[PDB]
Amino acid sequence: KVDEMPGATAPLGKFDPLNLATLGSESTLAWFRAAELKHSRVAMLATTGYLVQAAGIHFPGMLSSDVSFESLSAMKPLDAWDAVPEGGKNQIYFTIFLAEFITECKGTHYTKGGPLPTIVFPPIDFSTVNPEQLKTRQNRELNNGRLAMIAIMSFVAAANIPGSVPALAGNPM
Amino acid sequence: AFEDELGAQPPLGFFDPLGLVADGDQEKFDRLRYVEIKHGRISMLAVVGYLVQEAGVRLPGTIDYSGKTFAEIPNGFAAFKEIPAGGLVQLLFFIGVLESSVMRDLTGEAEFVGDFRNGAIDFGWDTFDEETQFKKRAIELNQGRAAQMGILALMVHEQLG
Amino acid sequence: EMSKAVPFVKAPANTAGYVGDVGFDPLGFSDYFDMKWLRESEIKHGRASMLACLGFVVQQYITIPGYTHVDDSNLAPQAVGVSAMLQIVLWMGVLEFWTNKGNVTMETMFSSPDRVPGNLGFDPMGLSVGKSQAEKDEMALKEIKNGRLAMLAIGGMIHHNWVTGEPL
Amino acid sequence: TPLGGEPVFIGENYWDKLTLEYGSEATGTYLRAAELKHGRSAMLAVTGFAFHKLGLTLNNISPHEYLSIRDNIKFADLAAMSPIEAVKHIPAEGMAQIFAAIAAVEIYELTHRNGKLAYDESVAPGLQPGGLTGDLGWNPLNIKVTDRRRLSELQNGRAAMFAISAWVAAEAIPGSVPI
Ligand code: CLA
Ligand code: CLA
Ligand SMILES: CCCCCCCCCCCCCCCC(=O)OC[C@H](COP(=O)(O)OC[C@@H](O)CO)OC(=O)CCCCCCCCCCCCCCC
Ligand SMILES: CCCCCCCCCCCCCCCC(=O)OC[C@H](COP(=O)(O)OC[C@@H](O)CO)OC(=O)CCCCCCCCCCCCCCC
Ligand SMILES: CC(=O)O[C@H]1CC(C)(C)C(=C=C/C(C)=C/C=C/C(C)=C/C=C/C=C(C)/C=C/C=C(\C)C(=O)C[C@@]23O[C@]2(C)C[C@@H](O)CC3(C)C)[C@](C)(O)C1
Ligand SMILES: CC(=O)O[C@H]1CC(C)(C)C(=C=C/C(C)=C/C=C/C(C)=C/C=C/C=C(C)/C=C/C=C(\C)C(=O)C[C@@]23O[C@]2(C)C[C@@H](O)CC3(C)C)[C@](C)(O)C1
Numbered sequence: 304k305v306d307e308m309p310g311a312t313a314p315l316g317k318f319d320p321l322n323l324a325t326l327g328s329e330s331t332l333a334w335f336r337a338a339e340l341k342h343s344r345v346a347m348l349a350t351t352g353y354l355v356q357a358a359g360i361h362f363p364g365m366l367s368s369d370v371s372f373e374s375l376s377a378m379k380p381l382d383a384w385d386a387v388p389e390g391g392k393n394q395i396y397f398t399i400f401l402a403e404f405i406t407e408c409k410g411t412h413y414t415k416g417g418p419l420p421t422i423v424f425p426p427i428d429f430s431t432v433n434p435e436q437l438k439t440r441q442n443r444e445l446n447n448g449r450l451a452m453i454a455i456m457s458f459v460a461a462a463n464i465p466g467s468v469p470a471l472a473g474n475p476m
Numbered sequence: 477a478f479e480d481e482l483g484a485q486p487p488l489g490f491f492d493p494l495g496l497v498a499d500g501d502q503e504k505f506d507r508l509r510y511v512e513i514k515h516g517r518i519s520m521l522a523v524v525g526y527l528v529q530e531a532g533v534r535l536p537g538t539i540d541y542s543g544k545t546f547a548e549i550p551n552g553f554a555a556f557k558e559i560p561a562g563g564l565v566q567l568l569f570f571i572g573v574l575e576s577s578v579m580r581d582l583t584g585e586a587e588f589v590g591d592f593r594n595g596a597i598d599f600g601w602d603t604f605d606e607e608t609q610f611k612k613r614a615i616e617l618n619q620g621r622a623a624q625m626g627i628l629a630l631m632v633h634e635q636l637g
Numbered sequence: 638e639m640s641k642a643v644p645f646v647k648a649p650a651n652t653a654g655y656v657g658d659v660g661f662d663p664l665g666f667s668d669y670f671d672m673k674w675l676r677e678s679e680i681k682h683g684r685a686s687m688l689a690c691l692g693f694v695v696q697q698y699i700t701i702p703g704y705t706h707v708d709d710s711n712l713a714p715q716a717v718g719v720s721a722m723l724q725i726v727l728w729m730g731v732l733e734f735w736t737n738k739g740n741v742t743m744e745t746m747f748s749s750p751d752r753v754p755g756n757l758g759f760d761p762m763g764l765s766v767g768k769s770q771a772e773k774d775e776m777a778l779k780e781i782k783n784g785r786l787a788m789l790a791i792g793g794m795i796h797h798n799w800v801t802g803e804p805l
Numbered sequence: 806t807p808l809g810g811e812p813v814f815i816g817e818n819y820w821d822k823l824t825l826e827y828g829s830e831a832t833g834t835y836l837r838a839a840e841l842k843h844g845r846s847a848m849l850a851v852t853g854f855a856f857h858k859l860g861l862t863l864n865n866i867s868p869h870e871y872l873s874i875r876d877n878i879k880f881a882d883l884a885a886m887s888p889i890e891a892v893k894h895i896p897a898e899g900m901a902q903i904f905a906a907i908a909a910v911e912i913y914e915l916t917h918r919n920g921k922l923a924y925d926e927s928v929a930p931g932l933q934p935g936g937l938t939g940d941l942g943w944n945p946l947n948i949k950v951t952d953r954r955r956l957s958e959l960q961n962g963r964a965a966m967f968a969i970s971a972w973v974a975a976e977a978i979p980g981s982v983p984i
């Protein structure tokens with residue numbers, strides 16, 4: 304049921320014109336739920352990770368042995384991805400590769416009604432937090448991700464097609 | 477006898493100038509439909525062949541491995557002069573296998589003669605009334621009648637020039 | 638009392654309920670050996686022959702890419718080597734152990750009351766499933782006869798080339 | 806007694822000649838299975854061809870365009886030599902890999918009957934009468950399995966088949982209709 308779900312706010316309510324929540328079973332909807340939950344958290348970190356990396360925040364010192372943080376007083380934030388060395392790019396994926404495991408190896412997987420993906424390290428005891436005010440936050444968490452999923456696509460389209468975005472094309476990136 | 481059957485149609489109708497079904501001298505009530513349909517089916521693929529096989533649309537590549545292309549092969553009885561004689565047998569043979577193995581009543585559920593498949597010229601056809609059968613089985617039969625006079629022309633006019 | 642096939646020697650016993658039965662056993666092998674093993678042999682010799690009769694003819698004209706066209710089928714192993722040949726026969730083995738649930742000798746085969754000769758369980762398309770007995774007997778007479786023709790065939794195809802030195 | 810045919814019009818024809826006189830009900834299943842396999846294959850092929858023609862390849866859509874990684878096989882060069890003359894430029898290693906996945910899938914469709922592989926059998930589960938129904942059971946996040954879905958899938962299959970056949974023909978030689 305789309306009623307009783309965080310993510311249904313005031314200006315639209317149940318937003319499903321093409322009826323995709325009905326398209327599978329209840330296990331199907333739980334997969335799309337934590338997809339959008341995960342699509343949000345990647346896009347929120349990438350949108351915010353685009354705005355800085357563009358104003359010059361600049362970690363002091365050396366990233367690696369000879370490829371130190373000149374990647375910011377230089378090439379666009381969409382770049383500095385091949386400038387990061389391979390052993391540096393490798394440990395990023397593998398910390399993620401580890402983090403995708405505890406996410407999957409809980410006692411009850413979430414499409415069987417289990418909990419949503421939680422923090423891998425330092426997991427405070429969690430949302431023992433007043434479930435009325437818990438529902439307001441999961442609306443806040445998803446809506447900021449909804450806005451960030453659009454925004455990171457704006458940032459790619461501006462870096463590929465100049466003039467594809469009006470009040471944003473006059474920005475050095 | 478067979479004045480109300482398939483093929484009798486205006487302006488002529490039943491028109492037997494030889495007295496062919498006028499008796500059963502060699503059981504003319506059957507097989508003469510089958511002998512009339514069978515020649516025409518050859519002729520309809522022949523004339524829709526031969527006119528398209530005059531217009532100049534060819535298969536790509538070569539007829540064999542030795543480089544003889546299809547575009548070098550002209551139309552007519554001259555096309556058999558540029559078929560090597562090993563091809564002339566196999567062109568007959570697996571067609572001759574069809575005469576003994578698909579060109580006969582195989583399953584025994586034939587409503588008619590030329591009735592072999594039952595389901596694949598069913599071209600949205602099941603909806604149409606039994607009368608539509610008699611129409612497009614006259615239209616089968618009379619295309620085949622008129623394509624022989626097409627192909628007997630287009631074989632004799634080549635030799636006449 | 639007398640044989641149907643050759644009517645001047647006595648009729649062979651213990652060949653009655655079999656498909657191509659015309660009483661042809663003048664040397665009396667069915668008197669001495671188990672009849673289920675002999676039938677299973679004759680079907681298998683026939684099926685390998687029928688595949689080899691297609692093979693011997695189609696190999697001259699079709700060749701799969703990567704190999705070398707050989708004019709005579711008989712010279713093909715030399716043109717394929719030994720490694721490729723051993724792979725064929727060792728996998729034939731693995732296909733034969735799974736075939737009869739591990740009962741591969743003349744003492745272990747036909748030790749179950751099931752397991753009739755030639756019934757592999759092989760029928761992916763559904764040919765002869767749910768039909769009557771006379772039709773089943775008729776189609777089994779065709780597999781034997783075509784297999785017997787192919788055994789004496791695959792001799793001639795192979796033998797013709799032995800003398801001569803050119804394809805079929 | 807088969808599944809739904811043409812929606813606008815229907816016609817079974819060549820079906821009772823093999824599922825009654827020549828074969829039986831077991832042949833019916835097999836035929837349907839084969840049809841579904843072909844349909845799916847055609848669909849994928851169609852999509853691939855479409856993508857290739859359009860231009861959305863690795864160079865256009867991602868940061869990596871070097872497929873060979875030793876044989877100097879970039880995506881740009883393979884996207885500039887059409888679709889039919891590109892499959893022949895694929896490195897043997899890659900070909901081997903692809904054949905592997907397909908082989909595995911086919912074997913599964915052959916051994917693993919229902920939930921798990923069958924250890925003892927005269928022949929493979931799918932090599933028996935009605936060995937392969939058509940459905941492999943692969944239904945990740947399965948939305949629905951109704952009587953409409955199946956029909957739709959089938960229709961998309963035949964259509965895809967025809968489409969790709971036509972496409973291939975046209976790349977090779979004068980077809981008939983436009984593209
Ligand atoms: C290629 C794909 C593939 C798949 C998906 C599987 C999957 C499986 N194998 Mg097989 N296997 C494979 C290839 C595959 N195998 C190959 C190439 C070999 C070597 C030749 C084996 C050798 C083998 C052995 C020896 C054994 C298995 C076992 C199993 C099953 C685990 C045992 C069990 O109790 O689960 C049962 C599953 C369920 C109860 C859930 C059923 C739900 C269905 C839908 C299955 C899940 C979907 C399906 C697997 C996905 C395939 C679709 C594909 C497009 C990805 C599991 C279903 C074990 C087994 O099944 O027997 C005890 C086992 O002993 N496998
Ligand atoms: C290899 C793919 C394949 C297979 C196995 C089948 C199999 C089947 N189809 Mg089918 N179909 C296909 C492709 C395929 N089709 C394509 C591309 C289309 C779109 C034109 C259709 C459209 C279609 C309709 C509209 C219907 C079926 C139906 C059926 C079923 C009954 C008909 C029958 O007995 O077989 C058909 C005959 C064969 C499979 C024989 C094989 C063909 C020979 C060997 C070679 C033909 C080559 C040919 C020249 C290729 C060019 C295309 C052609 C149009 C000229 C049967 C399971 C019917 C059904 O579900 O039951 C009522 C049905 O309603 N099909
Ligand atoms: C809690 C359990 C911990 C599990 C460990 C795994 C995650 C560890 C992350 C950090 C590694 C830190 C070790 C420090 C080591 C250190 O920092 O060395 C730095 C080293 C840099 O090497 P370079 O070749 O760049 O250096 C050459 C120059 O340094 C010489 O001039 O980077 C690494 O080797 C990357 C390690 C990635 C390893 C991937 C791990 C395994 C996952 C594989 C799964 C993927 C394939 C399967 C997919 C299905
Ligand atoms: C690369 C190929 C290797 C893949 C192995 C394929 C496994 C075959 C399938 C097993 C049957 C399973 C069916 C039911 C399972 C079953 O119960 O049957 C097991 C089967 C015998 O089964 P039974 O006991 O029912 O047979 C009757 C016995 O009771 C005897 O009276 O023995 C084997 O599995 C042999 C497997 C081949 C072993 C290959 C090893 C090679 C050794 C050869 C040494 C060479 C010496 C050279 C000279 C010096
Ligand atoms: C076209 C043109 O020219 O104009 C431009 C205009 C403009 C405005 C530039 C454009 C834009 C898009 C915008 C403005 C996009 C913004 C997107 C947005 C809103 C991105 C938020 C990310 C949230 C983060 C990072 C939060 C992490 C929060 C983290 C990591 C937490 O710790 C969670 C937290 O809860 C805990 C667990 C503990 C709590 O105690 C509280 C905190 C927070 C600590 C366009 C569309 O591109 C076009
Ligand atoms: C009355 C009448 O008319 O007939 C009746 C009787 C009759 C005819 C028997 C009937 C039937 C059955 C029919 C018509 C069956 C036909 C089935 C048909 C026509 C099946 C095609 C499959 C195509 C495939 C699998 C292609 C895969 C393509 C693949 C796998 C690709 O790789 C594509 C590829 O491009 C990529 C993506 C990338 C490239 O780098 C490489 C290539 C180029 C290879 C009917 C329906 O009952 C009608």
Ligand SMILES: CC1=C(C#C/C(C)=C/C=C/C(C)=C/C=C/C=C(C)/C=C/C=C(C)/C=C/[C@@]23O[C@]2(C)C[C@@H](O)CC3(C)C)C(C)(C)C[C@H](O)C1
Nearest residue numbers: 319320321345346348349350352353356380381452453455
């Ligand atoms: C809701 C709904 C519908 C819908 C929908 C919609 C709108 C779906 C939209 C989905 C959308 C819009 C999903 C975005 C993903 C973007 C991601 C994951 C960003 C990755 C960013 C990554 C991985 C990081 C990139 C960087 O590392 C790089 C490369 C450089 C570094 O310096 C750092 C940064 C971060 C810059 C329908 C279709 C209308 C039907 C019905 O209504 C149901």
